[PDB]
Design a protein around this ligand. Structure first.
Ligand SMILES: *[C@@H]1O[C@H](CO)[C@@H](O[C@@H]2O[C@H](CO)[C@@H](O)[C@H](O)[C@H]2NC(C)=O)[C@H](O)[C@H]1NC(C)=O
Ligand SMILES: *[C@@H]1O[C@H](CO)[C@@H](O)[C@H](O)[C@H]1NC(C)=O
Ligand SMILES: [Zn+2]
Ligand SMILES: [Zn+2]
Ligand SMILES: [Zn+2]
Ligand SMILES: [Zn+2]
Ligand SMILES: [Zn+2]
Ligand SMILES: [Zn+2]
Ligand SMILES: [Zn+2]
Ligand SMILES: [Zn+2]
Ligand SMILES: [Zn+2]
Ligand SMILES: [Zn+2]
Lengths: 184, 105, 105, 197
């Protein structure tokens, strides 16, 4: 059930004992729900609205947050013509029940050019910091990821998302205690 | 005897903490064995009350017990575990897991 | 029983501290009586090692002992006494003379 | 011997239900070690007393206040019912000399005190003690000179009770606190207990 990333981090932290981590507390948050929209002529890219349930104690000061995605050409024929593209993640402030990027209000986080099939790491600490300080006005705690394939590439270059069950997205929040371990 | 730190290996399966502790599977928690017998030297960092109580025990062994040999300082370990909500949590310093120093209190 | 703070008056002549303590000659030092039996509740402020060792005690009661009931916080008293050089010393807060809180460690 | 009742009274004061906690946690009493007394002369019409103490306060302690308590009394004189009036001054002795008392050496003025009633007087001389703690090992201190000046209509032999007398001798009262707010002091307290144990 826990990601191998978390286990690798433990092995990393316990191996390199001569080097202390920048963040003492690390948590893993799997995706709660996903709304996927295929590419259209008006919007030639894959749209994914990812909903998480990140809840970090207020006595904790978060340092860094990672969004790990599995980029893969979804088992298509004639995929051997190459594999090149890019993906962009936006922090969603205002949503709407029509389409994905074709509505709402977003703040740009990270742009990532992709090549190798596999896991990518996107530093989206900014959004999580905004999610902790919710202020209860806008419906957040969610973000949208778009996957753009370059010319002469895979038809369905995308990230593995629900309702699939293999290599699903998840958050990694790096945090430390403000009271230096007293309250935590 | 002498209030001192001894070895103590703790398998989480034995205590049932394997249900939430992902790593490690077992660790060295150490233990404070021995008794706080007169006189209490510097090497057990006695408190004034511990000294008082010790002297009272010698005088009134039927009414007052001697000071106990307990962990004075504790050292953290690295622990990977699941939160109450099932959230995988990794803590490089999980405070209070192993004995650093023993003493008389 | 249960780990709790109890009363304990200490006459310094009985322990021989009348040889240097001018006042109060006798005071309330308190005492931590009782045992740290499973489960360890919040009212003894148990540490993680105390919790671990207790769980180990349940598993191996012949090899590993339970946590000890010891003073967690100590309160000062007013003491008039003579220094090692014979210098009369008055200390309004003479730290660590009486038990404030008890706990399992 | 036994500690002065002043220390005991301070204890009783601290232990009585006072609404005001003391300014200083640590209080010590230092009696005079030796005294050099010179009677009044025509050149110097006053009683001269050089008082030597053995004050030793730990460097981890920050002293707040020091009191020099003297017993002013017309020394069992005839016509002592003619009054008791005068003044007394204490100097911190920096440089001494084996000739006379005030007629030589180097002094720093501390306290001037007009006296009337026979009994104990209190002189706030915190300044001198602070210099004694910060010795710097250059100048020979840890001592002070007290002079007693009698007025016209007073006692013939107005003085303070000092050695080689044995009644109501002078002593120091040092009010002190710990610099580390009790951290370093309670450590030295503990090592003292294990020694007493
Ligand atoms: C996301 O996490 C929050 C925790 O903050 C969960 O909120 C709980 O929801 C239940 C539902 O009845 C309440 O009884 C609890 O009181 C809530 N806890 C808190 C701390 O508010 C929420 O259920 C989670 N969502 C999902 C889909 O798992
Ligand atoms: C004076 O006080 C010092 C404190 O350091 C002590 O060592 C010494 O023995 C004392 N001397 C006398 C004569 O009391
Ligand atoms: Zn926290
Ligand atoms: Zn295709
Ligand atoms: Zn690009
Ligand atoms: Zn038992
Ligand atoms: Zn205190
Ligand atoms: Zn003349
Ligand atoms: Zn001191
Ligand atoms: Zn005058
Ligand atoms: Zn006059
Ligand atoms: Zn006259």
């Amino acid at each position: 059930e826990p990601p191998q990333y978390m286990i690798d981090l433990y092995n990393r932290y316990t191996t390199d004992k001569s080097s202390t981590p920048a963040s003492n507390i690390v948590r893993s948050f799997s995706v709660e729900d996903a709304i996927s929209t295929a590419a259209t002529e008006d919007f030639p890219f894959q749209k994914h609205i990812l909903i998480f349930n990140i809840s970090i104690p207020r006595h904790e000061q978060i340092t860094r947050a990672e969004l790990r995605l599995y980029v893969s050409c979804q088992n298509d024929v004639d995929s051997t013509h190459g594999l090149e593209g890019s993906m962009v993640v936006y922090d969603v402030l205002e949503d709407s029940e029509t389409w994905d990027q074709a509505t709402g209000t977003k703040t740009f986080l990270v742009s990532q050019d992709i090549r190798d099939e596999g896991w990518e790491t996107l530093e989206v600490s900014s959004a999580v910091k905004r999610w902790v300080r919710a202020d209860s006005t806008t419906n957040k705690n969610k973000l949208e990821v778009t996957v753009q394939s370059h010319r002469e590439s895979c038809d369905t270059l995308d990230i593995s998302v629900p309702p699939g069950s293999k290599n699903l997205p998840f958050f990694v929040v790096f945090s430390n205690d403000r009271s230096n371990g007293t309250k935590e | 005897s002498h209030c001192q730190k001894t070895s103590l290996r703790v398998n989480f399966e034995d205590i049932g903490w394997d249900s939430w502790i992902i790593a490690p599977k077992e660790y060295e928690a150490y233990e404070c064995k021995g008794g706080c017998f007169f006189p209490l030297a510097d090497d057990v960092t006695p408190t004034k009350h511990a000294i008082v109580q010790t002297l009272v025990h010698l005088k009134f062994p039927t009414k007052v017990g001697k000071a106990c040999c307990v962990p004075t300082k504790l050292s953290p370990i690295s622990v990977l575990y699941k939160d109450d909500m099932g959230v995988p949590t990794l803590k490089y310093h999980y405070e209070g897991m192993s004995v650093a120093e023993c003493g008389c209190r």
